[PDB]
């Protein structure tokens, strides 16, 4: 209960329809969570120097769900207020925040809606429990909506996970920015205007300015009150054991999610009773989520199977049946080459150049400046390259071309595909003309 907020993020059928696959939806959702975590962690909210996020259930609604009569999110046309209300109509006591990700256009082109937090009174925001409220229905107001399209055009992911930050900030008790100090976009000072407005702006920022990813001083101070009055209510410790998020960790053997999340037949889901949940089923001795060399029928693979493919320092790696995890790779012998013949492997990774494989140290080092340079270890007595006749027993006569891009002449060049290297600074025709004219050409030409 220190610094982490558990999110219940749901995606409607249009989100899946645009992204097509569950993998794409989960990748976008993890990207949004990571972006919002990066935004919030850096922003020192006065009281706390780190406020992370950790999604607990990634619940994704498939296009086939659209035919479900009891699902109210299938309606193609629906107001933003009504959308947020139906998000709040569900029970969300076990979550710091609960969000619905949609791909539907909203009236006036709004990019979503959340519930404004408050330090004291005005129920609604983070760490909010279900209560009767008015209208006769118990609404969990730890809820917010977000759409990835406005005016019929899909919102890019920078703007999408900026408006996600906007909605969570409203859930965090930060109102829309006001004043010249906290809204620099409208400021007539050019230096501040180029920085751009902050996240907590009534109008969606383009996401291409400096302050578009950062919380303002106004918003940070507002969030400070909420995070000093309600943080130790629903937050959790960093890295706390909370299974069902699809992330295997300590205190568990495997993870599946919830009942309608995974098709794994050898791991208990979250709806299973305490103690059994997120654990291997009795009899199924391993899980594919645990290790990459487990059978689809959830049993330890034999010794024939090899987890990994060919590597720069190992052949394949063999796990056999004793653990789900594939063990450390069996390294190739010392001085074993890697990509092209520029370096050799020592301790499972290749570094330290090539020339010490047969034994000599790399030279620092007109086309002879680009392949590889190494002398006899006793000082640059003969700094000749690999293909030189001075090395007639180690490299024979084979020349090793550097990678296309690796610099020559310290770091004022770059090797091309033609064993040559041009200056990275470069001159350019027009700039050469400018330097030939801006110089005192009266005596430079004659």
């Amino acid at each position: 209960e220190k610094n982490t907020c558990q999110l219940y993020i749901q995606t409607d059928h249009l989100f899946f329809k645009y992204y097509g696959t569950r993998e794409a939806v989960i990748a976008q959702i993890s990207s949004h969570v990571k972006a919002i975590d990066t935004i919030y962690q850096t922003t020192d909210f006065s009281g706390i120097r780190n406020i992370s996020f950790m999604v607990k259930r990634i619940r994704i609604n498939t296009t086939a769900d659209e035919k479900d009569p009891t699902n109210p999110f299938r309606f193609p046309n629906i107001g933003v207020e009504k959308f947020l209300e139906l998000n709040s109509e569900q029970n969300h006591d076990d979550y710091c925040l609960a969000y619905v990700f949609t791909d539907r256009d909203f009236d006036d082109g709004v990019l979503g809606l959340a519930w404004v937090g408050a330090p004291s009174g005005s129920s609604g925001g983070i760490c909010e429990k279900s209560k009767l409220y008015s209208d006769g229905k118990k609404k969990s107001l730890n809820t917010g909506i977000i759409t990835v399209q406005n005016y019929g055009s899909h919102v890019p992911p920078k703007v999408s996970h900026i408006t996600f930050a906007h909605e969570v900030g409203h859930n965090f008790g930060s109102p829309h920015d006001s004043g010249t100090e906290c809204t620099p976009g409208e400021s007539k000072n050019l230096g501040q205007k180029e920085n751009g407005n902050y996240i907590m702006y009534a109008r969606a920022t383009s996401g291409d300015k400096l302050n578009n990813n950062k919380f303002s001083l106004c918003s940070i101070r507002n969030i400070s009150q909420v995070l000093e009055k309600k943080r130790n209510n629903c937050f959790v410790e960093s890295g706390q054991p909370i299974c069902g998020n699809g992330m295997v960790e300590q205190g568990e053997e495997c993870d599946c999610g919830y009942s309608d999340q995974c098709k794994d037949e050898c791991c208990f889901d979250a709806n299973q009773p305490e103690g059994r949940k997120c654990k291997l089923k009795p009899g199924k001795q391993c899980s594919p989520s645990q290790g990459p060399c487990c059978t689809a029928q959830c049993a330890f693979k034999s010794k024939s199977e090899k987890c990994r493919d060919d590597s720069d320092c190992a052949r394949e790696g063999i796990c056999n049946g004793f653990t789900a995890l594939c063990p450390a790779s069996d390294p190739k012998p010392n001085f074993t080459d890697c990509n092209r013949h520029t370096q050799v492997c020592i301790n499972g990774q290749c570094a330290g150049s090539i020339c010490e494989k047969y034994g000599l140290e790399e030279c620092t080092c007109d086309k002879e400046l680009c392949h590889v340079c190494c002398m006899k270890k006793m000082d640059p007595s003969t700094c000749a390259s690999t293909g030189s006749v001075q090395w007639s027993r180690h490299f024979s006569g084979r020349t090793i071309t550097l990678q296309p891009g690796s610099p020559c002449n310290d770091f004022r060049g770059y090797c091309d595909v033609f064993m040559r290297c041009r200056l990275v600074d470069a001159d350019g025709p027009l700039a050469r003309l400018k330097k030939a004219i801006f110089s005192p050409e009266l005596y430079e030409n004659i």
Partner: antibody
Amino acid sequence: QVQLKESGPGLVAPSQSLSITCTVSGFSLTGYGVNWVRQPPGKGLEWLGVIWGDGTTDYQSTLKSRLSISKDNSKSQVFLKMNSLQTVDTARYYCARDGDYGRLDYWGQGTTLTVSS
Amino acid sequence: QIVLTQSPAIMSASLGERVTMTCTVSSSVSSGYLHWYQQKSGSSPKLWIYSTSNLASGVPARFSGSGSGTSYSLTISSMGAEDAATYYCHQYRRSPLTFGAGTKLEIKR
């Protein structure tokens, strides 16, 4: 409260199939597993097999061939089917729920099973 | 494969005494995964102790089990006159679900 009840044929002809139904109530079968433990007359408990919340089954190794357990989550009924029961198969067939940490907290009354030509 | 050895098989304790019940597993299993059920010779085995330290609902407090690892136990502070039942030690952390042989109990009169 939460109760489990088993309906059994009682009399089973030798080498003829058996069907017992444990119509559970009070819990969602999707999140709880219902076991099947039989008991010979005045003997120790014997485990047949279980059906989990996701429909997965794990039977006893010595009764794998004959055992058959299925369920309908919406209908809230657990079904146990046995085939070719010899004279030793007579027992009392209890259905139990796999609670927290594998505990068999709630049990049914059970059905006496008599096998005799 | 696990076998839950329960000793002693037959308990004969006079009224009001302290009778202990021992369940020994073949391989060490988690403390919370072992349980206890009594069966009063014609009734469904009701859960008595779960996690080997927490009592069930509607049970006397004289039952105080304990154990961790390879050997487990169940202790009775005062032998109640209605305790005539077979107490079963059980585990389902690993397949198969193995019930104990059943430590029968009788009132030594």
